[PDB]
From a paper:
CENP-E is essential for the alignment of chromosomes in metaphase.
Next, we sought to determine the structure of this minimal corona-targeting domain. This domain contains a highly conserved region from Xenopus to humans that is predicted unstructured and flanked by two predicted α-helices. We obtained protein crystals that diffracted anisotropically with resolution limits between 2.14 Å and 2.71 Å. Structural determination revealed a parallel dimeric coiled-coil in which only the first helical region of the construct was observed in electron density, likely because the construct underwent C-terminal degradation during crystallization. Surrounding interactions that stabilize the coiled-coil include salt bridges between the E2470 and K2471 side chains. Overall, the CENP-E conserved patch and flanking helical coiled-coils are essential for outer corona targeting.
Numbering used by the authors:
A (entry chain A): 2454 to 2508
B (entry chain B): 2454 to 2507
The structure:
Amino acid sequence: KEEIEDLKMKLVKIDLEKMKNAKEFEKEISATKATVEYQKEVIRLLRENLRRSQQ
Amino acid sequence: KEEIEDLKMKLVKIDLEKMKNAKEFEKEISATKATVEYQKEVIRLLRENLRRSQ
């Protein structure tokens, strides 16, 4: 019965580490994808200023 | 012992999901970070061209 208790605490720990990692993953995918969109706009601004400087 | 068996299985199942999630994260993050780094290089090179043009 002591083992059941230890196993259940280990189950609680491993699930919490699973949740923590999944939330960090989600956070970093979102921030990195937002950077991709931010730099897509920077690139658009660079093309527009370059067109006008050339014309 | 039956409950012990269920717990040990559940421990194995969760550690397996942890590894699976980790691998899928690392796959996607590396692809996206690659796009980010190519974008940064495009940006540097376009900025040079713009400074030249002006």
